[PDB]
Amino acid sequence: GEELFTGVVPILVELDGDVNGHKFSVRGEGEGDATNGKLTLKFICTTGKLPVPWPTLVTTLVQCFSRYPDHMKRHDFFKSAMPEGYVQERTISFKDDGTYKTRAEVKFEGDTLVNRIELKGIDFKEDGNILGHKLEYNFNSHNVYITADKQKNGIKANFKIRHNVEDGSVQLADHYQQNTPIGDGPVLLPDNHYLSTQSVLSKDPNEKRDHMVLLEFVTAAGITHGMDELYK
């Protein structure tokens, strides 16, 4: 629940990936401040060079750090499933290109929130925008649309990421998401709402390994009932 997220929380991220047979690993570390909706992480490709553009991994690499406004806190499934955690699964369909399938478990290991991911990508084009590394190193702002999945006792989400391509075009990545709690504990199943997400990508000038520094802000919105500041 909310009590685990009231301060600054250390984060660890571990990804094992395989895209068109190219195997790679990513590790990240940082901290999250759910009260302000802020995440700061640094990621390293521990196997060498990354075979895909860093931006294509941003969404895969802990929505429990979203800032839910006071009047919406009963719609925060992610924190309600902690510390035991949840499984997050996605299909990410890159328009005119391949598909990522991801499975992650997000849970606390003591004081640390840990996101452990497996990623499998198939059907990518050798000189498409992904395997051809034609995406700009930046990120746009997007909304993540959430709805309850009573039958799986969790949530579904959908959104479309727009990756800037170096030639001025846009590479769409359609996201279909499911989250299911780990274990049988009670959870909060929300009304429809969304997460507004901003991200800033940068580099550590003293880092020689292939890496990504990330700052992210995430707030929940889309429900108005109970927000008295909106009356007048």
């478990």: which residue's tokens?
Answer: 105
Spatial distance between the Cα atoms of 171 and 132, rounded to a whole number of angstroms: 13
Q: Which two tokens stand for residue 132?
A: 């051809």
Residue 135: which residues within 8 A CB-CB, separation 6 or more?
A: 53, 55, 56, 129, 163, 164, 165, 166, 171
Give the residue extent of every domain in the chain. Answer: 1-232
Resolution (A): 1.7
Pairing of strands 8-19, 112-122: parallel
Which experiment gave this structure? X-ray
Residue 89: which residues within 8 A CB-CB, separation 6 or more?
A: 101, 102, 103, 104, 177, 178, 179, 180
């995406």: which residue's tokens?
Answer: 135
Nearest to 163 by CA among 130, 131, 124: 130
Nearest to 170 by CA among 125, 134, 132: 134
Pairing of strands 99-109, 86-94: antiparallel
Q: What are residue 107's DSSP bridge partners?
A: 114
Longest Cα–Cα distance of the chain, Å, equals 58
Q: What are residue 8's DSSP bridge partners?
A: 33
Q: Which two tokens stand for residue 107?
A: 């849970």
Pairing of strands 8-19, 193-202: unpaired
Q: Which two tokens stand for residue 211?
A: 């890496």
Spatial distance between the Cα atoms of 20 and 25, rounded to a whole number of angstroms: 14
Burial level of 111, CB count in 10 A (0-12/13-18/19+)?
A: exposed
Residue 26 · residue 51 · CB < 8 Å: no
DSSP E strands: which ranges in 150-192?
154-164, 170-181
Residue 208 · residue 45 · CB < 8 Å: no
Q: Which superfamily, per CATH, for 1-232?
A: Green fluorescent protein (2.40.155.10)
Phi, psi of 109 (to 5 degrees): -110, 90
Nearest to 81 by CA among 117, 105, 116, 59: 105
Helix (H) or strand (E) holding 80: helix 77-80
Return the amino acid letter for 173.
Answer: A
Nearest to 182 by CA among 160, 152, 202, 162: 152
Spatial distance between the Cα atoms of 182 and 98, rounded to a whole number of angstroms: 30
Pairing of strands 211-221, 193-202: antiparallel
